[PDB]
Ligand SMILES: Cc1cc2nc3c(=O)[nH]c(=O)nc-3n(C[C@H](O)[C@H](O)[C@H](O)COP(=O)(O)O)c2cc1C
């Protein structure tokens with residue numbers, strides 16, 4: 001009788017519970033950034049979460065910044081993702097594809113023709129980046145020309161078309177964690193003087209242009225967006241985050257979107273951080289009138305409290321879902337949680353990916369049966 005386990009109606013999508021698999025980069029794509037049968041097994045295993053949001057999926061090669069992340073820009077990638085959505089849907093799950101452009105968080109080694117990564121302004125993030133040829137320092141990115149923004153928006157439009165073709169119930173716009181859209185939002189990274197820079201309105205313009213474009217493909221009630229209102233991850237900064245995110249969330253409220261997905265400030269991208277901030281989900285609940293997903297650092301007890309107190313409608317879990325494909329059933333049964341192994345988060349094979357155990361072996365068996373059937377059905381000949 002946990003509220004976490006209550007079925008939830010997401011504008012017609014009957015979910016099984018109020019728990020969400022948070023988007024999680026795993027770096028396990030096959031050649032040419034194509035999802036594989038192993039990826040289908042991983043998501044099928046986790047189909048008991050009310051909603052799955054995929055790993056961030058680049059809309060273009062320019063939008064990639066880490067090895068072996070899947071794309072959504074070729075027909076072969078669509079075909080691989082259809083294997084994934086087939087397996088999830090045969091397990092009665094619901095799945096949204098997270099659309100990604102890494103912006104400056106990349107390296108020219110990943111880019112078409114060895115070009116520099118692109119960004120709102122020519123400001124390198126601090127630190128180093130993993131490439132095919134080992135760790136390298138970040139480069140100063142190329143500032144996008146005003147005219148080029150429309151082309152990136154068109155890439156989002158095309159990615160949504162391919163998501164709809166792949167077989168996704170919806171899409172989530174990644175506008176968090178230091179990537180291209182977040183870089184436009186914040187004045188520490190956006191020094192532009194065109195219509196995409198300066199005012200809070202201008203800084204958020206690209207986000208609304210992306211939503212305009214993808215909403216020509218999916219209805220607005222199947223498009224979500226993810227924000228990190230107060231994070232230092234990947235050298236992000238802004239001089240007035242309360243004003244920026246208050247404006248942004250209020251404007252998104254009017255857009256009739258599937259949901260707004262907010263990351264709590266106590267998470268720095270992929271790790272826990274000691275951080276004082278008022279810009280958590282409680283700050284934004286009164287400012288957004290639709291479905292609100294809260295993510296970051298939650299446990300069973302704290303997730304349940306968010307729902308009981310009506311600070312959010314859905315609770316997303318990342319690291320616990322990596323390790324516990326049947327997390328809802330473990331919460332329901334007060335079962336121990338498998339520990340998550342950070343060493344196998346990124347890259348590698350089945351180990352630390354599809355080999356975390358279920359309470360009920362029949363759950364594992366059914367996930368494997370559906371992944372195998374989906375591969376046989378959708379295999380490229
Ligand atoms: C290995 C790993 C990969 C992640 N990949 C993504 C991603 O692709 N897109 C995204 O928006 N967030 C990503 N995140 C952030 C998570 O979605 C989530 O916000 C974070 O893990 C905190 O939630 P948790 O405490 O439930 O793990 C990732 C986090 C981890 C640890």
Ligand SMILES: [Cl-]
Pocket residue numbers: 056176177269
């Ligand atoms: Cl991320």
